[PDB]
Design a protein around this nucleic acid. Structure first.
Ligand SMILES: [K+]
Ligand SMILES: [Mg+2]
Ligand SMILES: [Mg+2]
Ligand SMILES: [Mg+2]
Ligand SMILES: [Mg+2]
Ligand SMILES: [Mg+2]
Ligand SMILES: [Mg+2]
Ligand SMILES: [Mg+2]
Ligand SMILES: [Mg+2]
Ligand SMILES: [Mg+2]
Ligand SMILES: [Mg+2]
Ligand SMILES: [Mg+2]
Ligand SMILES: [Mg+2]
Ligand SMILES: [Mg+2]
Ligand SMILES: [Mg+2]
Ligand SMILES: [Mg+2]
Ligand SMILES: [Mg+2]
Ligand SMILES: [Mg+2]
Ligand SMILES: [Mg+2]
Ligand SMILES: [Mg+2]
Ligand SMILES: [Mg+2]
Ligand SMILES: [Mg+2]
Ligand SMILES: [Mg+2]
Ligand SMILES: [Mg+2]
Ligand SMILES: [Mg+2]
Ligand SMILES: [Mg+2]
Ligand SMILES: [Mg+2]
Ligand SMILES: [Mg+2]
Ligand SMILES: [Mg+2]
Ligand SMILES: [Mg+2]
Ligand SMILES: [Mg+2]
Ligand SMILES: [Mg+2]
Ligand SMILES: [Mg+2]
Ligand SMILES: [Mg+2]
Ligand SMILES: [Mg+2]
Ligand SMILES: [Mg+2]
Lengths: 119, 155, 73
RNA sequence: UGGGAGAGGGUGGUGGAAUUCCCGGAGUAGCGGUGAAAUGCGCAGAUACCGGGAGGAACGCCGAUGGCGAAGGCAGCCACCUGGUCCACCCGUGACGCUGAGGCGCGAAAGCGUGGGGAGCAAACCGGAUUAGAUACCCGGGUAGUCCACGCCCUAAACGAUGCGCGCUAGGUCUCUGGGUCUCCUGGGGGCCGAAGCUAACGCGUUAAGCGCGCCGCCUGGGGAGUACGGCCGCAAGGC
């Protein structure tokens, strides 16, 4: 109910979830989905299947706005990462490209204990 | 089987249809090595499916089996303090095994007093797409799939 | 592996201290603005160390990048 | 005299990434977290996206088996101020040397005083789980502190667990940094493996744990005990 056609797909992978957000040609959320959005509570969300279901949920809700092409942006190193991508390609949407933009500091804030023990 | 991979016993073709799959089914029916009693039961059933049906018993057989084979099943596994029903594809050799076993199992659950009748009905009833044998087969597939989330644990 | 071609070889004579020569300096960065390692630039301990200061210099001026988006994965 | 390499030190100044917070847009129902979960956060709209701003702390790739420093320790970039040091020439002085009880200065982290700063992290603490019970390990919060200035404290597995200087005693190999006629030669560093030899053994082996000379420090069975007492030092903790 706003027709967009082409846009961007943001895959936010991690070890506890995979949340996907579909944006217009310049960053505005049209629809989104996540492991929890599809039903899985707790650890289930982190599974790659959830990822797939989530990426698909997003796509289906996407095309509702007449979406057809997407540029994918992946942030994170979770498990769903690769599955979510697979999902989109096979969703019907055209994956115009894929770019990994995971944020990484040039050393800034002291990480929490669980992420240290590092050198 | 820690060393080799155990080769499958090759069975002797059926005394009547010259089919190996029949000998198997017979074997599964058999209990306490009464292969005679077994064989007869299957055969009488063949003649029962021959009557109440116009189709050939041998073909009815094949079908049922084919209908009761599971193509997916969940195999339990241990992963960091937890057991998971991991969906797994099902080996052809194991399918035939589970199919034949199930038919007989289901068959003897039936109400009809006479053995052969129970096999007879269950068998034909199976090729029809119904019957407890097929329900088991379906529950198994429903079990698998329904745990596709734990599918990445390929095993 | 890594037998593609050391950047030094795949190029002529240059002044490692020229912090403004984008067209050449840029050849020493990966698909990402990351400063390539010696196993890739085919430079010596001493040269590599000078290149480092040169690149960081450009980056600050605005001539070279600090980090680029990977385009695949 | 000429020249070299360097995260050596001090002072300003600056750059980009990331986190947090605030503003705006767009967006729904969760997010987060774990072995599994809760606590928690979210329809006074969170999470995930895009734009803007504020602030603090640290400095990715290069950066190594690397480099510099007496040690502790030192990595974004620029400028200034500044210590050590290596090489070449063989130019000047003529032992002017070595060591070094006391003394003085330096001295990671935590900690102390006064005043700033505070994004992230996090003793204590407040909660959620786990458990036979957890004053824990895991999870959500979180104060001192971590950062700055000035002053204090003066400890450590402050380690190569090896005091400093000098001369002498096969080589091979890698590496950093000079000079040369540049396959290589000759210096100054960093590593491996090894002659002779040394060692209880492990190992060490022209960075010695070898062969020698000089000077300092220290040891003399374990426990009691780095305790008691005394002195000295410190705001205290406490140190010697
Ligand atoms: K005393
Ligand atoms: Mg989760
Ligand atoms: Mg000089
Ligand atoms: Mg320095
Ligand atoms: Mg907002
Ligand atoms: Mg609530
Ligand atoms: Mg409402
Ligand atoms: Mg050095
Ligand atoms: Mg050290
Ligand atoms: Mg002279
Ligand atoms: Mg004279
Ligand atoms: Mg002295
Ligand atoms: Mg003297
Ligand atoms: Mg100190
Ligand atoms: Mg401190
Ligand atoms: Mg203080
Ligand atoms: Mg915290
Ligand atoms: Mg216990
Ligand atoms: Mg309790
Ligand atoms: Mg905590
Ligand atoms: Mg020290
Ligand atoms: Mg040490
Ligand atoms: Mg001494
Ligand atoms: Mg050597
Ligand atoms: Mg050596
Ligand atoms: Mg021994
Ligand atoms: Mg040796
Ligand atoms: Mg010696
Ligand atoms: Mg010794
Ligand atoms: Mg003593
Ligand atoms: Mg005694
Ligand atoms: Mg004693
Ligand atoms: Mg003692
Ligand atoms: Mg003490
Ligand atoms: Mg006093
Ligand atoms: Mg003490």
């Amino acid at each position: 109910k706003r027709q967009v056609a082409s846009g961007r797909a943001y895959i936010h992978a991690s070890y506890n979830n995979t949340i996907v957000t579909i944006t217009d040609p310049d960053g505005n959320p049209i629809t989104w989905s996540s492991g929890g959005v599809i039903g899985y509570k707790g650890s289930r969300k982190g599974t790659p299947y959830a990822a797939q279901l989530a990426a698909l949920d997003a796509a289906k809700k996407a095309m509702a706005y007449g979406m057809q092409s997407v540029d994918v942006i992946v942030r994170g190193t979770g498990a769903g990462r690769e599955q979510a991508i697979r999902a989109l390609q096979a969703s019907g949407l055209q994956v115009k490209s894929i770019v990994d933009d995971t944020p990484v500091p040039h050393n800034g804030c002291r990480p929490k204990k669980k992420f240290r023990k590092a050198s | 089987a820690r060393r080799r991979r155990a080769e499958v016993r090759q069975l002797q073709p059926d005394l009547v249809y010259g089919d190996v799959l029949v000998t198997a089914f017979i074997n599964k029916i058999m209990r306490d090595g009464k292969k005679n009693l077994a064989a007869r039961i299957f055969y009488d059933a063949c003649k029962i499916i021959q009557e109440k049906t116009g189709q050939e018993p041998l073909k009815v057989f094949k079908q049922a089996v084919e209908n009761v084979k599971p193509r997916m099943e969940v195999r339990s596994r241990r992963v960091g303090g937890a057991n998971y029903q991991v969906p797994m594809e099902v080996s052809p050799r194991r399918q035939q095994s589970l199919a034949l076993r199930w038919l007989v199992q289901a068959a003897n659950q039936r109400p009809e007093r006479r053995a052969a009748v129970r096999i007879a009905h269950e068998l034909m009833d199976a090729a029809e797409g119904k019957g407890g044998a097929v329900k088991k087969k379906e529950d198994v597939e429903r079990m698998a799939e329904a745990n596709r989330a734990y599918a990445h644990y390929r095993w | 592996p890594s037998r593609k071609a050391k950047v030094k070889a795949t190029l002529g004579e240059f002044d490692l201290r020229d912090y403004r020569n984008v067209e050449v300096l840029k050849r020493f960065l990966s698909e990402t603005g990351k400063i390539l390692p010696r196993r890739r630039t085919g430079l010596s301990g001493k040269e590599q160390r000078i290149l480092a200061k040169t690149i960081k210099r450009a980056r600050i001026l605005g001539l070279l990048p600090f980090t680029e988006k990977l385009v695949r994965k």
